[PDB]
Design a protein around this ligand. Sequence first.
Ligand SMILES: Nc1ncnc2c1ncn2[C@@H]1O[C@H](COP(=O)(O)OP(=O)(O)O)[C@@H](O)[C@H]1O
Ligand SMILES: [Cl-]
Ligand SMILES: [Mg+2]
Ligand SMILES: [Mg+2]
Lengths: 261, 4, 10, 298
Amino acid sequence: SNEVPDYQEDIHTYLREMEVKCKPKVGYMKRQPDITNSMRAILVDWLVEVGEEYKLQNETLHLAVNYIDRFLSSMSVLRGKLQLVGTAAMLLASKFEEIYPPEVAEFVYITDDTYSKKQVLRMEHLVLKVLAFDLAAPTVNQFLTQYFLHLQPANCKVESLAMFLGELSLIDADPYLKYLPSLIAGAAFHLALYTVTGQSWPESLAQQTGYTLESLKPCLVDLHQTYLKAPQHAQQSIREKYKHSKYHSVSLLNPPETLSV
Amino acid sequence: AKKL
Amino acid sequence: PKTPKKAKKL
Amino acid sequence: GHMENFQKVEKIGEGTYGVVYKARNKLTGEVVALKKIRLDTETEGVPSTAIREISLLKELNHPNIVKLLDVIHTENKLYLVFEFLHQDLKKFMDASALTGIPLPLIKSYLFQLLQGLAFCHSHRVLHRDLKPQNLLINTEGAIKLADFGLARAFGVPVRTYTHEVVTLWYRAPEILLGCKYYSTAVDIWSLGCIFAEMVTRRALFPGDSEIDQLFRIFRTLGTPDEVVWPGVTSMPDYKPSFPKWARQDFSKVVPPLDEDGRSLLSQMLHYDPNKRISAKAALAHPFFQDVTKPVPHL
Ligand SMILES: Nc1ncnc2c1ncn2[C@@H]1O[C@H](COP(=O)(O)OP(=O)(O)O)[C@@H](O)[C@H]1O
Ligand SMILES: [Cl-]
Ligand SMILES: [Mg+2]
Ligand SMILES: [Mg+2]
């Protein structure tokens, strides 16, 4: 019994304004002396598993990643502390998003005692200070759920596949830090729709978003490659997650070989 | 439980 | 009238 | 400034979540409200309620929403520094209980509350705790939404959120009946209750338990059925044994209200959350055609 219509256009406009303001610095990893895109990929892939173990929302995962990228945009971090940043970020995202955030002792457990409770809580404080408590960031997930409304009737397989593709974008900072969440969501939605039904990004969405199919192309080219190469990627947690029936096992679907485009 |  | 507390998990 | 720069004047408040002082900045003279949050009692770090309250208040800059001036975060303590307003609407109502709040002021306050709420909803924020003690008035005729500790950023479309939210008297029927989804309509219900309460000088639905709350609503608005509220008989907490009461005429419920006021109130109290009036649509209601901004008598 959901109702969204009166303020729905305003919300989409507002989120489009805030994604610009909440965007991490695209080039930040070249300025990190000790950490790399590969370490970040390992971290995010682990957070996916943590979210599954604790039955956390997909939104919580997307927020945690936004917090991490913004923190690393202004703070140099040694490789041995990167998991501490990630853990505090996931705790904060859980507190923001979840009805039931896991307790700190559980986050300590899930790192296998790599860090103490004191450290996790001190890191929480630092992340809050560095982000100036601005935690309500737009995510690819928030844009996806709004886009899904343009399918009547809903297609649950398209939605699952779109979420899967959107989640895969979290892992690889290069290329995906270059694109805003609304644009990634648009590429993921189209690619998912096309794969499942053979249809294309709808005019209603082109109007609402201002993105033509053409303007999705560069991101779409990337996402299609990512999709094709997913079974070969060093990080596998998202594929494993989306093999489940709750996701209609969409990670087992074969990508289209070419894009009509 | 994993140390990265 | 007091603001309600989140019910305990489970 | 920082903590040594505030002089505590008086304790003005407490609530489930926080301890509030009236205080003054010793350097600039500015009077503030300090909401103190205890981390030491907290071995779970910063409370989810504070995180949401701060992050969301920082996004909401509107004349009808209380302003957060500063946040002082120490290892042991978290202070939110707010602009200070004269009093909350509960204390005003109590002081007005014998005389009544003049109709033009009631209309002004509701209009302003709707402006603040519409802004929240357009910013994807549900307040979820609207009641008179969470609303603040100044000496110039302004009223503002406050106490965002229960607030949440919501998704389009929504998913299941915390079941235990609004203070009982102000709680919407879809929550009482256990719906897995609720949204902006819950805040409109609360405001409808508060509107009626300003008019009659007493709480509209002063329930002492969840069933008593539900039955007080049914006795006033009639027991809902599939016709007024499709799906109602399938809600998790609905029972077919609920007594079936007929709806009362609003002339009995809110005698002082004119035709326009009764029309607006009935739309704010609509059973079906999908047909309940939005804050934005309410602002366009004929009731507000003559709206002014009188000064309250304090
Ligand atoms: N900015 C303010 N100016 C004046 N009084 C306030 C202000 N903020 C809160 N109060 C008073 O303190 C009480 C508790 O504050 P609130 O923020 O609602 O805390 P809680 O979440 O614990 O209920 C309020 O009901 C109000 O009467
Ligand atoms: Cl109250
Ligand atoms: Mg309060
Ligand atoms: Mg509160």
